[PDB]
């Protein structure tokens, strides 16, 4: 498939930026999570970044650490996450779906088998949090063989060699954390999405104005879930309100 | 790109988020430079000798082997300042931190003694030390928390996630990802992402080097085998290193068998785990069928690491080193035996290594063999643990 | 009649019941013989080196003296096997016991670590060890009681009298009066009846001998003064001995001041006691106006001995050595200071000696002086004591 | 005075052995102790050995250790002991009185002053438990200057040189713990009293038959006190019964 390519082409024809929210699959529960995701989509999310709960997420911060806790407490497993992914794709045929994984869950039963499973359920990209470009060969190779876009993070402390590698290895979009944007475009890198501290409408407009193709809210969505655990209805209401505002800022 | 090979066969690597790669590359470079700098070596040797107490003794244990054809020696790391071998490499890493122009040390610990070790090295060398540890661990480790605070270290309780060791580690690395320019992450074992497995080995190899010289002086030949417990792998690789090219010398690593391998409650990932990717490395580990990392178990907290250093996994794969396991009860018996017959109270971790040497002797009492057990630490810290058990 | 002088000036002697004199004469003779026997010396040196960990390091403490003209070194007896200097002489006495054809060791202890020391030496050398201790002390010393029992020693609770240390000592000596042919009484300090003050000094003098060689190697000259705490006097005389004829070297002994000399609650009999006859010797002691022996007091149990070794009383009388006192609070501060600035946790006993060196430095920061403090032991055992105090 | 010399001469004219009981002054109290001592005398004790409570009696055994405890619990001091000694002598002019002391209580305020105090109250001998003949010079010299008999213990493990010293240094009587008796007589030692395990009439007759001039009950009396602490009247009754039997065995 070419969901990311089709999305960005459509956004470009509309001189629009992309707004991508992240959430942990199964947080706070399978059912409530499916509702959350449908709400994010209805509210205007252009794409989704979805995490699969892992026991030792050495990268993520407290908000995410607690998100996994809630998901595990609900008995969420990678197998159930893939069941959810299939359901989500059956309901939404064109929205790009990206996974945020930890190396062990991808490597566990065979790297190739993992990306084959992703292709089977309809996933579009996979960002493996603890696999730097230096260790990415078997991962990106398997991703490509299964029509999955391998996504890489372009850190603050990135140098020129890293920019070139990310431009060369990545597909779908470049996960960014003005010159960087110009250099990435110069090296024909996948469209860049700003993912650093995206929690307010003005940050979304700023990202697009800086040259990025959009913005990723890495934890603002999770915080809203964490805050409304007592009232699922109010949780969805606030999520719809936030996403709608963030997406409006991209137009 | 790196200066040294990050892998030992298929094991090892640098599986960390991209943001931490510069910190690792910087450290590898400083290490390579330091290893070629006579001044760094002289400074490191001075601290080991005049502060830590190296070289440590090599004690012959006649009472234990009486009536058999086994001759047993114990490498006395229990006499090292701090009571355990950990001191050797934390001093080395502290010096590397200073070489890089850093004045801060970051570490994390649970029930281990790595926090105390990191704190004492930081106090000696004028480094600001901050140690992360799960809130739950703080409440159960009052003694060590006090030791670290007495030594000027800032103990930071972590409440996020499950408030356990994994959360402390996460916080420590997150911290380091933003402060590596002024702070050094002190990893406590020969594991994790390159260059740590290599650095820790090199900063612990004096154990094996001294043992070689001491055994040649006393017996006029090399050991038939050197035996060491394996939690993360540092004391064992420290003993093994200088002997790797001596093909006639057996290298035996002892993982904790806990309540018994068949019970599932053990800490023997090298021989009973499954290869995975965790803590920045590809290595054998305790994990669920679907890839979640499981916890190891052992009467000895020090051997409670769900994985193992990559070089050990490699040495095993090619048959250069052999790994076995010893149960809680076997380690307890060895602990009692050393106390009663040699007047030495061994750490329960070290007791696993002694327990295996005792088995090698007892199973074939007429087999002539010269053995060296690495007594990685003293067991004063285990008196309560052992007392309560024997009690019940 | 004796082979050696039982007195140091008017101090010392053999004030024991007639029935114990043969035991003392026998011991003195064996000692004199052993001191001239190269084989005994070689055997003793082998144990000290390969079992106990001698020689111990001499650590320079730059961080502590920064900004002053004082240069401070610490003799690391805290790194000796067992954690304290006591190990040196118990090994020596155990060898003497074997020389006399004995296979049993008798000792007594209260809150001290002499029981553990006697037990470990007995386990190593195959001696049957029995340690007497007041019933009241048993109930409060569960940890050490367990250590001694782990090492095969028979711990005998004494219920007679006040069920305290003095009753244990009495029972031990009564025992010895009837069993000296097969058992040796292991006295734990440089006090008591001749020949013990002399034997203990000689079996602890390697402390001073090593210090002399180490300071000459590092500074090219002798210390302006060597400083050591004084409970009974063994670690101090061990440090002092080899320096006595070096007139330029000051010998400073530090008695515990407890809550303060003026409070009456201290353990400084040498400078604030009165000469008397007790525990087989004539020496300064804590006593009532009518001659009953009083108890000493100190935050540190190890310095809780109501009298002092006769040789110290003598060295003081002729002005060769100077004695001072340090209070509980002064010792606590030194303890904290060493932990924070050097990463070494000192025994509270040793902390008294460090506290005085700190005072010598701080009172006259521009005075050029090379000092050596005898760090008689490690303070892991004092963490709880210090923790609770700071708590309140 | 010459109380011991006069006693033994009288016992000899009667072909009789001496029976000497030991008790701690002030055990269990000053008043009860004075009564105990008067009872021992009335029952037939030929002489007395009296101990002064000391904080660290390294020699004595449990029975005596507990005797001192009781005495200290009653607030007994050396000063009060001397007050008792004066009272005892005022009531009994000829019975020899011996003290069993620990070196510090004798040395404390001056050795000479101590023996002068003994002479003043009417004591006849002093055995210093922790002063072997080798360290006895200043003690025996002070004793003699004040007409006090210095007494020494002749142990089981005694050799010939010790026998000669004890024979030469001692006065009053030799505290013994057949050949020894002959050698002591050979060296003109003070009359020997057997003090080892004297707790039954047959041991007293045996001692005299062996050549000794008598026997000393080192702890049998104290045991009787310890056993009847609840009934002072019964205590005195049993003490009178025991001493009477022990003394009869000496005739
Ligand atoms: C920390 C420790 C160990 C375990 O660590 P390795 O890295 O596996 O050596 C073993 N023994 C002692 C005494 C320890 O303190
Ligand atoms: C026993 C002890 C002492 C006191 O004994 P001395 O005989 O006075 O030396 C001092 N320091 C330490 C650490 C001790 O264990
Ligand atoms: Na492990
Ligand atoms: Na003292």
CSV table of C-alpha atoms and ligand atoms in Angstrom, one decimal, chain C residues 83-86 112-114 188-190 200 229-237 300 302-303 312 347-350 375-378 381, ligand 2:
chain,number,residue,atom,x,y,z
C,83,UNK,CA,37.5,-5.7,59.1
C,84,UNK,CA,39.8,-4.8,62.0
C,85,UNK,CA,43.3,-5.0,63.3
C,86,UNK,CA,42.3,-7.7,65.9
C,112,UNK,CA,33.2,-6.4,71.2
C,113,UNK,CA,34.4,-8.1,68.0
C,114,UNK,CA,37.1,-10.2,69.8
C,188,UNK,CA,42.0,-9.6,73.0
C,189,UNK,CA,44.1,-6.5,73.9
C,190,UNK,CA,47.5,-5.3,75.1
C,200,UNK,CA,49.9,-8.6,71.8
C,229,UNK,CA,42.6,5.3,69.4
C,230,UNK,CA,43.1,3.5,72.7
C,231,UNK,CA,40.5,1.2,74.3
C,232,UNK,CA,42.7,-1.5,75.6
C,233,UNK,CA,45.8,-0.4,73.7
C,234,UNK,CA,46.6,-3.0,71.1
C,235,UNK,CA,46.0,-1.2,67.8
C,236,UNK,CA,47.8,1.9,69.2
C,237,UNK,CA,50.9,0.0,70.6
C,300,UNK,CA,31.9,3.1,70.6
C,302,UNK,CA,35.2,-1.2,71.2
C,303,UNK,CA,36.7,1.5,73.4
C,312,UNK,CA,50.8,3.1,77.4
C,347,UNK,CA,34.8,2.2,62.7
C,348,UNK,CA,33.6,4.6,65.4
C,349,UNK,CA,36.6,3.5,67.4
C,350,UNK,CA,39.0,4.6,64.6
C,375,UNK,CA,42.3,3.3,60.8
C,376,UNK,CA,41.9,0.3,63.1
C,377,UNK,CA,38.7,-0.9,61.5
C,378,UNK,CA,35.7,-0.4,59.1
C,381,UNK,CA,29.0,-2.3,62.0
E,2,LIG,C1,38.8,-3.8,69.2
E,2,LIG,C2,39.0,-2.4,68.4
E,2,LIG,C3,39.6,-1.3,68.9
E,2,LIG,C4,40.0,-1.3,70.4
E,2,LIG,O1,41.0,-2.2,70.9
E,2,LIG,P1,42.5,-1.7,71.2
E,2,LIG,O2,43.0,-3.0,71.9
E,2,LIG,O3,42.4,-0.5,72.1
E,2,LIG,O4,43.1,-1.5,69.9
E,2,LIG,C5,39.8,-0.2,68.2
E,2,LIG,N1,39.4,-0.2,66.9
E,2,LIG,C6,38.8,-1.3,66.3
E,2,LIG,C7,38.3,-1.2,64.9
E,2,LIG,C8,38.5,-2.4,67.1
E,2,LIG,O5,37.9,-3.5,66.5
